[PDB]
Design a protein around this nucleic acid. Sequence first.
DNA 1: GCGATCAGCG
DNA 2: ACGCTGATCGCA
Length: 579
Amino acid sequence: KMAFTLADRVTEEMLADKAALVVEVVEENYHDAPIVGIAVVNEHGRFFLRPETALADPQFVAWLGDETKKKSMFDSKRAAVALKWKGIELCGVSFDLLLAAYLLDPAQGVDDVAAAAKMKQYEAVRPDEAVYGKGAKRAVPDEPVLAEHLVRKAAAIWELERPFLDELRRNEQDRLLVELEQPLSSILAEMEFAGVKVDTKRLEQMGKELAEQLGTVEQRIYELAGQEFNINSPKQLGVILFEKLQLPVLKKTKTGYSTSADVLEKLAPYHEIVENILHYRQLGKLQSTYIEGLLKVVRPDTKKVHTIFNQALTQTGRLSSTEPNLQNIPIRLEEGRKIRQAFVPSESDWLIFAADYSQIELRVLAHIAEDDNLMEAFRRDLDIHTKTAMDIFQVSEDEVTPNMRRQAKAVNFGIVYGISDYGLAQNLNISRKEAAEFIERYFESFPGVKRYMENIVQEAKQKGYVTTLLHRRRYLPDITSRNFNVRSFAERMAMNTPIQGSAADIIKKAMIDLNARLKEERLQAHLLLQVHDELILEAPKEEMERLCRLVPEVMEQAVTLRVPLKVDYHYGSTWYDAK
DNA sequence: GCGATCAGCG
DNA sequence: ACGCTGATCGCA
């Protein structure tokens, strides 16, 4: 139905200096995956090219790489990375509709052109799922169905560019797309393509040790339970604890019984089996996710893992990381931290270099809230949990006990997550009366945080949305709900999102400043991972000393706040050893 | 197939 | 409590 040239070869009129480009990769995981079709819409009309044709033609390749040839796309990163696996550079992406849709309203969950198009009541395009199927039965259709689909997506991107950019202009989000999220897309593409080398022998050996520990702990749980069962069934585990062993229920559920982590911590004193079950859960997570799960996504030629950073998913502006998740590798417990010994540099006599912001969230809160007490704590580089304990419990530094520090620590997390008596009470295992007392005492020591948290809830109601430092938005319609619980969640989001979101803005800006500085200095160092408030690089060992000065200077000066930003850095032979 | 329940991550 | 993903369960 839609008019286009199904083209047999590339022609000059397909290489105009402005174009909607669709480079279609149908595999969900785009790493080394086929490109199945290409579509170009421009001043001269609508074209479909076969990829074997278009990607052998040197005039098409030059066009793709010529940064003065401007492209409007959807998920430019998907196309850039599939093109990198083929030795082809994409350049001149001036508009990414996925990133434009995500900045206007992350709540829409826009992950195809069809859904972005619905924001401007453009409906003359099919959803990808309707054309392809989903996950398993996800197939490439015959050429006529495919060609029409790609051309309609490109016609859509061609129409929608001016309206998305007008609304981003009005939102004052125009620079957030053009100077932050689009240049970041390119950097993320480099990091994904680079990958992270994995010592698959270390994994298999750690796996052997875990199967033996896990063998012993399982057998001990069968000895103590007096009967075999599935420890990985929260339902069967409930029967064994609360019916067979008669352990007390301290927290009623709907279905029957809770075996959550919080519940088993409080049950530990009542039976020897409870700590063995928590250990089996520790070991069983490492074995299933970080040994077996990691081995099946390692490329067997290069032994690298290529994550996919989803830049348009989180409600706050954080990235996320899939297949595998490299933003949730163990560190907290020693046995788990040893998994990081399998993450190695990709070249001989390179090292891993890790740099991490120290308490970016509380430093952002200090700036945004303009709280004199919190700004001064940071200007003295005080231990902020100890100072919080000093203020809420009314004691000098040397009179703070570890137990006071641990509880003032929970108040501090409470504050940034959006504080509630019920929340702090659950976390600290105290009454809601006791928690309301800590919060009350926190607010008279931190009167600016108090004023800020009341003003941010009022502003989310007045405006309909809350905002970060670089003008990311989140709509909070539930802030007016007459359901207490629904409204309270929205108050916490109003409190937490500009903190977590502004932290994300700052590390993203640092990633862009870091790459411009590595290029200027023409260092071999490159990014591998971002884990929310930490950057991870590999470089030749001869670069470590330049990096120990450069990486922290750039992360520190990413943005100017009323408090300094502080960075700790480590390097070493393996991810484990950069600590 | 999908929600719920667990673990991992800041 | 705020924000995420993966392996598993057991009911459909």
